[PDB]
């Protein structure tokens, strides 16, 4: 069968791993065997050394440990237990009687203690809490940094680029150095603590011959700085000094109870007052602390600092000398003269996401430091040398804020198992919901839409239709995120005419700083360009002319479409409206028996069923022993040929089983026995897919022509021949269960031999309590025989009257079995009986 192809447009690179984001990121937190002390170790550096100083007690952290789990693996799926592995840390506590772990005498120390227990990752990369697997989706927010906004009104003031300076560390302080004329200088601290700024500079060692004598010459808007100093008409210098000139004593005048004096006044604002014995009662907050640094050693707050400001002084500020107040005020004037530092609000280069790897950090810290409020309570009751072992730290507190995140958060949802293809697309999205500060419900007409910078980043097509438009989206095919946050997209580089075939992954940060051309641009041999009017763009602004300005071009044209909207035949003929209404409904598909690959395709349906991990993939060569339609076993050649000595690796073929949304997830063996298979070979095809590509629906014929009215509005008639072949059969499957109780009357039991007055309950139940598999009746019958005595096995006289008319036969026990609920019945799949097993059941 000859294969005639048309277009090709060869690509220098293929589609990266779609499930690469949620794999490497989570492996940078646990840190068990590979790395030593980095990820997880950073979590113990925040809580420890936990110091509850109450005399002579200190707890120091050493190292961690990951041993064996709680119990078996195949046992927490039938009880609802999150499979995890406890941790072991070293503690070193000291008693007032000088008892620190360092010797062998009078020095006790424990090394192995298991309390906390965090979940793990397996194969694909999905957690599992309370039986139901949980998946965490990364959200999008504005990266913390120094930006420049605007301010209404004013129309007669100063400030930075425009007006009010607005910075966002993370919690530290909102430094506001605005300028309001008239009299009092407008300056905030943390909220709105209003106070004259004329005494602030005085504290930082600045006389009246610095800020108002060498700055008022270039601007006469210092009516707020020439108030306290009071520099009216030229008069006698000495003997006429005020707050400004002098520093220590300072002028002692003010219409109020207290009195101002620069230095010894910054605290007088808070009534009543107290002696200057506290030189650092608040100044110790703007220095050595998590106030300034927005991340570990300014690993995030670096690009958004030295790039706009000047340089950098230590992680914080320092003692008396503060270079965090002078390096910021120099900007409010710099731009006031002529610079150009405007930051775009709706800019991708200013917003990054937080993968599961990062979310696993901040959520593990808040859960660990939670026990701190419990290790101090058990201390007040402590005796002497008995409060050393695990009599302080508790497992419950630390194992609480960790289980309430992977099952109870705005980023934790159930995976859509309606379609194997819809599975990967569910994680291939980024919700705009999250923090209340980084995300608001305000009217953002210029945000809830698509920006030109999303070209190659986020597919402007695949977006949930409805009120939540623009918020939720999806990742492109050639769109991958690094270890930072921003999305990185391949872009070939050029240098004046010549073009290099080699691509270059670049973030969205420099995307607006540099110019990017078009892929469909003419090009004749690497060296010369064939156009003088290159149609390129420059950060939400399509430019024109000039060929030397560009430095990057689009290598692929598929970078615009997502991973699910690229399977549809002919996209150029489809409108952006229906191109979405055909994708949001595609993820709501359902595996059908009669499933076949569409006659036409694009060649991307195969790469989907592979990365998704639907079909079985062998990891070692060898022949096939059995090929049952429910179990397949492959024997390898690593051990001597022995009936009971070999690499037995049974492949559990999941038959008709449940699902998150009552769907059908089965596999059909496509490989015969005898024929040797190797790595990459498919063992069994997935549910809704043939050979391993698409195959969601099917193809039928059609006599396109109206039918006398019957097809009014979206009304469609279907031939009966289609029903005859039952090509549209979907298995729903439900879930029933019978629970025995210890009633006061008397605990009941399940058995086939029931003292009932009927036989209908005996026809089914015959296998000693349980019933055989597969059959047929109707709703309102008996599934599990139940014998629960009522009325304390004592009949009433007046009752015997009623049954005396319709055959006197009142037995002590009756048949109170669970009847079938209203609706439609169905066959049974499996039957499980746990009559008090010797295992660890609760």
């Amino acid at each position: 069968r000859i294969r005639k192809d048309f277009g090709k447009r060869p690509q220098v690179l293929d589609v990266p791993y779609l499930l690469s984001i949620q794999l490497d990121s989570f492996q940078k937190f646990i840190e068990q065997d590979p790395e030593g002390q980095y990820g997880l170790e950073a979590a113990f550096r925040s809580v420890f050394p936990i110091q509850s100083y109450s005399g002579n007690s200190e707890l120091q952290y050493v190292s961690y440990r990951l041993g064996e789990p709680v119990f078996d693996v195949q046992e927490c799926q039938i009880r609802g237990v999150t499979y995890s592995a406890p941790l072991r840390v070293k503690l070193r506590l000291v008693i007032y009687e000088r008892e620190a772990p360092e010797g062998t005498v009078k020095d006790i120390k424990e090394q192995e203690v298991y309390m906390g227990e965090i979940p793990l990752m397996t194969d694909n990369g999905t957690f599992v809490i309370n039986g139901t697997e949980r998946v965490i989706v990364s959200q999008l927010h504005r990266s913390p940094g120094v930006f420049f906004d605007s301010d209404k009104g004013k129309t007669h003031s100063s400030g930075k680029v425009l007006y009010n300076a607005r910075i966002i560390p993370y919690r530290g302080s909102w430094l506001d150095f605005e300028f309001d004329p008239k009299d009092n200088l407008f300056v905030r601290i943390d909220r709105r603590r209003k106070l004259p700024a004329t005494i602030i500079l005085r504290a930082l060692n600045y006389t009246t011959e610095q800020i108002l004598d060498l700055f008022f010459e270039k601007v006469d808007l210092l009516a707020k700085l020439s108030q306290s100093g009071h520099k009216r008409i030229e008069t006698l210098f000495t003997n006429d000094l005020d707050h400004g000139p002098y520093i220590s004593e300072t002028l002692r005048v003010d219409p109020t109870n207290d009195r101002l004096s620069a230095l010894v006044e910054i605290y007088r604002m808070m009534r009543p007052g107290e002696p200057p014995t506290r030189e650092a009662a608040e100044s110790l907050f703007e220095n050595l602390f998590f106030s300034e640094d927005r991340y570990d050693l300014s690993a995030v707050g670096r690009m958004k600092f030295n790039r706009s400001l000047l340089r950098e002084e230590i992680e914080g500020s320092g003692i008396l000398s503060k270079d965090d107040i002078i390096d910021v005020m120099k900007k409010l004037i710099d731009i006031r003269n002529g610079k150009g530092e405007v930051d775009d609000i709706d800019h991708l280069g200013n917003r990054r996401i937080r993968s599961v790897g990062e979310m696993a950090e901040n959520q593990f810290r808040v859960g660990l430091v939670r026990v701190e409020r419990a290790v101090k309570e058990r201390l007040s009751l402590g005796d002497l040398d008995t409060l050393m072992p695990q009599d302080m730290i508790n497992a419950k507190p630390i194992s609480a804020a960790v289980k309430e995140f992977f099952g109870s958060s705005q980023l934790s949802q159930f995976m859509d198992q309606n379609n194997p293809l819809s599975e990967i697309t569910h994680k291939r999205r980024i919700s705009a919901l999250g923090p209340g500060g980084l995300t608001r419900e305000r009217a953002g007409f210029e945000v809830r839409d698509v920006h030109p910078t999303h070209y190659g980043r986020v597919c402007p097509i695949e977006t949930p239709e409805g009120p939540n438009i623009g918020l939720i989206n999806s990742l492109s095919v050639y769109a991958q995120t690094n270890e930072y946050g921003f999305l990185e997209t391949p872009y070939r580089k050029v240098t004046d005419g010549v073009v290099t075939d080699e691509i270059h992954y670049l973030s969205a940060i420099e995307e607006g700083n540099y110019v990017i051309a078009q892929a469909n641009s003419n090009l004749d041999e690497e060296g010369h360009f064939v156009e003088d009017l290159v149609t390129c763009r420059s950060k939400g602004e399509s430019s024109l002319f000039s060929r030397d300005q560009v430095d990057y071009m689009d290598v692929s044209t598929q970078q615009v479409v997502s991973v699910g909207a690229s399977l549809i035949p002919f996209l150029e003929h489809d409108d952006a409206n229906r191109a979405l209404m055909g994708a949001n409904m595609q993820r709501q598909a359902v595996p059908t028996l009669r499933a076949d690959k569409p006659l036409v395709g694009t060649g991307m349906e195969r790469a989907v069923a592979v990365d998704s991990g639907v079909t079985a993939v062998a990891k070692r060569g060898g022949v096939v022993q059995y090929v049952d339609a429910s179990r397949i076993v492959i024997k390898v050649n690593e051990d001597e040929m022995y009936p009971g000595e070999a690499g037995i690796d049974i492949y559990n073929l999941t038959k008709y089983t449940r699902s998150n949304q009552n769907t059908c997830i089965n596999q059909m063996p496509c490989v015969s026995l005898g024929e040797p298979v190797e790595r990459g070979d498919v063992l069994a095809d997935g549910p809704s897919t043939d050979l391993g590509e698409l195959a969601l629906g099917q193809n039928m014929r059609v006599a396109f022509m109206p039918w006398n009215g019957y097809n009014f509005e979206d009304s469609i008639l279907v031939s009966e021949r289609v029903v005859q072949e039952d090509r549209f059969t979907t298995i729903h499957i439900q879930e029933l269960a019978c629970v025995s109780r210890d009633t006061k009357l008397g605990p009941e039991e399940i058995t086939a031999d029931i003292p009932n007055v009927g036989e209908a309950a005996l026809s089914k139940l015959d296998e000693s309590g349980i019933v055989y598999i597969g059959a047929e009746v109707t709703g309102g019958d008996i599934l599990v025989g139940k014998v629960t005595p009522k009325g304390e096995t004592q009949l009433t006289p007046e009752e015997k009257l009623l049954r005396a008319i319709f055959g006197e036969k009142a037995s002590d026990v009756k048949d109170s079995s669970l009847r079938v609920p209203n609706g439609v019945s169905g066959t049974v799949i499996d039957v499980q009986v746990f009559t008090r097993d010797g295992v660890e059941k609760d």
């Binding site: 298991y114 072992p389 695990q390 009599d391």
Partner: protein, 88 residues
């Protein structure tokens, strides 16, 4: 202050030892957990206490709040906890 709240604490009257029997089995649960490391099964504590094992389970059912009535459920508009119980 330890006499008034010793009985008339909850909205409904509550015995004295009924609240003193809870913390009694508490200062021993962690006692065997800090040593062995396993949960104290209702077999070893049945020989140290005056309670068998069956009736002791029904005792916990009594120790509750229990629950109000005017609490939103799903509709959060007109639906109340005490508005779904049928009358006999």
């Amino acid at each position: 202050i330890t006499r008034s709240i010793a009985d008339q604490a909850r909205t409904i009257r509550i015995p004295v030892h009924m609240i003193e029997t809870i913390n009694k089995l508490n200062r021993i649960s962690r006692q065997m957990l800090q040593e062995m490391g396993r949960e104290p099964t209702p077999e070893e504590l049945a020989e140290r206490m005056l309670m068998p094992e069956d009736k002791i389970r029904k005792v916990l059912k009594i120790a509750k709040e229990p629950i109000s009535m005017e609490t939103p459920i799903g509709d959060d508009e007109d639906s109340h906890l005490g508005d779904f119980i049928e009358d006999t």
